[PDB]
């Protein structure tokens, strides 16, 4: 599924990311675009052979299981394609995770250098939430 900016802002508050580890809701919009385009199903390979899954880009390397990336984790105990389905629970749940961490959302390199210290309530103007 490929949300609209509005849509998957609505999914992600009703999934109970607004606020979340003190992110506003335009951060983890903002997060999505930037690493998924908001497309649940995208799938990126890595240099070191781990695979980033789904809408937040959900690394196999700690994260999920994908049964091919060695001396791996799956610290969110679900198979990576979970992390595609059109509904968002696994993502948000596994997110969740990722997010409490220590490094907040510097988790994702996207946010990090795309997302972060810019207006990211743009991200949610004019959204019936
Ligand atoms: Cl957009
Ligand atoms: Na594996
Ligand atoms: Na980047
Ligand atoms: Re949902």
Not at 44 to 69: A, E, F, K, V
Not at 88 to 100: D, P, Q, R
Request: proline letters at 2%; one cysteine or more.
């Amino acid at each position: 599924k490929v949300f609209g900016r509005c849509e998957l802002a609505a999914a992600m508050k009703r999934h109970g990311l607004d606020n979340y580890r003190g992110y506003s809701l335009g951060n983890w919009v903002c997060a999505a675009k930037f690493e998924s385009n908001f497309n649940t199903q995208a799938t990126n390979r890595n240099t070191d052979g781990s695979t980033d899954y789904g809408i937040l880009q959900i690394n196999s390397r700690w994260w999920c299981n994908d049964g091919r990336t060695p001396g791996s984790r799956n610290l969110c105990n679900i198979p990576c394609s979970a992390l595609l389905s059109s509904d968002i629970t696994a993502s948000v749940n596994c997110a969740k995770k990722i997010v409490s961490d220590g490094n907040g959302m510097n988790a994702w390199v996207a946010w990090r250098n795309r997302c972060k210290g810019t207006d990211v309530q743009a991200w949610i103007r004019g959204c019936r939430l």
